[PDB]
Enzyme design. Structure first.
Site, short mmCIF file in Angstrom:
data_model
loop_
_atom_site.label_atom_id
_atom_site.label_comp_id
_atom_site.label_asym_id
_atom_site.label_seq_id
_atom_site.Cartn_x
_atom_site.Cartn_y
_atom_site.Cartn_z
N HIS A 61 0.82 -1.20 0.00
CA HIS A 61 0.00 0.00 0.00
C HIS A 61 0.85 1.25 0.00
O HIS A 61 0.54 2.20 -0.72
CB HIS A 61 -0.94 0.01 1.24
CG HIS A 61 -1.71 -1.25 1.43
ND1 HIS A 61 -2.74 -1.63 0.59
CD2 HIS A 61 -1.66 -2.19 2.40
CE1 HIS A 61 -3.28 -2.75 1.01
NE2 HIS A 61 -2.63 -3.13 2.11
N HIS A 93 1.69 9.15 1.62
CA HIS A 93 0.68 8.98 0.59
C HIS A 93 1.03 9.94 -0.52
O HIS A 93 1.44 11.07 -0.24
CB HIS A 93 -0.73 9.31 1.14
CG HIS A 93 -1.08 8.53 2.38
ND1 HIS A 93 -1.88 7.42 2.36
CD2 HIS A 93 -0.73 8.70 3.68
CE1 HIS A 93 -2.00 6.94 3.60
NE2 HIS A 93 -1.30 7.69 4.42
N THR A 196 -6.53 4.33 6.44
CA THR A 196 -6.64 3.06 5.74
C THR A 196 -7.39 2.09 6.62
O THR A 196 -7.41 2.25 7.85
CB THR A 196 -5.27 2.42 5.41
OG1 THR A 196 -4.64 1.94 6.60
CG2 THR A 196 -4.36 3.38 4.72
C1 LIG Z 1 -2.63 -1.31 11.70
C2 LIG Z 1 -2.98 0.12 11.30
C3 LIG Z 1 -1.79 0.86 10.73
C4 LIG Z 1 -2.03 2.29 10.29
C5 LIG Z 1 -2.93 2.59 9.27
C6 LIG Z 1 -3.09 3.90 8.83
C7 LIG Z 1 -2.34 4.92 9.41
S1 LIG Z 1 -2.59 6.61 8.91
N1 LIG Z 1 -2.57 6.64 7.33
O1 LIG Z 1 -1.46 7.33 9.42
O2 LIG Z 1 -3.91 6.97 9.39
C8 LIG Z 1 -1.45 4.63 10.44
C9 LIG Z 1 -1.32 3.32 10.88
ZN LIG Z 2 -1.10 7.57 6.45
#
Ligand SMILES: CCCc1ccc(S(N)(=O)=O)cc1
Ligand SMILES: [Zn+2]
Ligand SMILES: OC[C@H]1O[C@@H](O)[C@H](O)[C@@H](O)[C@@H]1O
Length: 257
Positions: A61, A93, A196
């Site tokens: 991803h 991203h 995500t």
């Molecule tokens: C296991 C989840 C891991 C995780 C997913 C998404 C993000 S974010 N894009 O920073 O909201 C951080 C950590």
């Molecule tokens: Zn993120």
């Protein structure tokens, strides 16, 4: 499983992750005129001097730079936060084109990319318990615009050739995340979620107002990564951003007057 394509992207996620339609989802558009200065915010403290990076991973991803979080080393404190949040990873991203790629937007304007430094609240012991708590995580978000090169990003860029495909990792010790920050720590903050799956509503977002500049060549190398695994048809890792979600019953607060 989930991804960013037409058939598995953000518009599909709610079928397996119904919280995708929840009350505190991220990212959001930051309407700068409506955001209000909050005098109750304490000074923000980004304390990364003893950070211990370990590894860089292509997870299919994005790519994650992982840190040793077994002790209080790299931490985030202050601002809207109660107590100490420990850095566990960062990732980005980004877009297929410089005109999109960020998750948060600023008065609807999309940046070329967005850096997320992910931290967990030490009162909960481990990241896994922290993501069962409303105040379990703090993510420091930093916009990227294309202009001059960011010297502190180049070590990341140069290792990407070795993690081109999903599941590949490489040693990434002795990386200093202080080199990814802008000069100013002015920020906006609001309560939200992971962007995500599993989209958990655990995050205090702290989004810096000042972008960092990276060069076109640096972001072009992000776009040479692959979503696919080795030996599979090439799918360029681009446009791995979730669009802005409804603000609902939230207010964005500003650290600056
Ligand atoms: C296991 C989840 C891991 C995780 C997913 C998404 C993000 S974010 N894009 O920073 O909201 C951080 C950590
Ligand atoms: Zn993120
Ligand atoms: O009732 C007044 C209060 O309304 C809230 O929505 C705002 O966040 C506060 O800054 C304000 O003082």
């Amino acid at each position: 499983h989930w991804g960013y394509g037409k058939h598995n992207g953000p518009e599909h996620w709610h079928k397996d992750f119904p919280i995708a339609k929840g009350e505190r989802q991220s990212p959001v558009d930051i309407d700068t005129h409506t955001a209000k200065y909050d005098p109750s915010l304490k000074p923000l403290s980004v304390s990364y001097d003893q950070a211990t990076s370990l590894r860089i991973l292509n997870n299919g991803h994005a790519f994650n730079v992982e840190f040793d979080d077994s002790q209080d080393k790299a931490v985030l404190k202050g601002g809207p936060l109660d107590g100490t949040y420990r850095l566990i990873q960062f990732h980005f991203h980004w877009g297929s084109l410089d005109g999109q790629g960020s998750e948060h937007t600023v008065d609807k304007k999309k940046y070329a990319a967005e850096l997320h430094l992910v931290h967990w609240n030490t009162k909960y012991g481990d990241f896994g318990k922290a993501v069962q708590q409303p105040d379990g995580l703090a993510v420091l978000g930093i916009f990227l615009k294309v202009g001059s090169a960011k010297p502190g990003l180049q070590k990341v860029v140069d290792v990407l050739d070795s993690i081109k495909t999903k599941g590949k990792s490489a040693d990434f010790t002795n990386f200093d995340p202080r080199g990814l920050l802008p000069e100013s720590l002015d920020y906006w903050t609001y309560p939200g979620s992971l962007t995500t799956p599993p989209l958990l509503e655990c995050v205090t977002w702290i989004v810096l107002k000042e972008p960092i500049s990276v060069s076109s060549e640096q972001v072009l190398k992000f776009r040479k990564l692959n979503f696919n695994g080795e030996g599979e048809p090439e799918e360029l890792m681009v446009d791995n951003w979730r669009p802005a979600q409804p603000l609902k019953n939230r207010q964005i607060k500003a650290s600056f007057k």
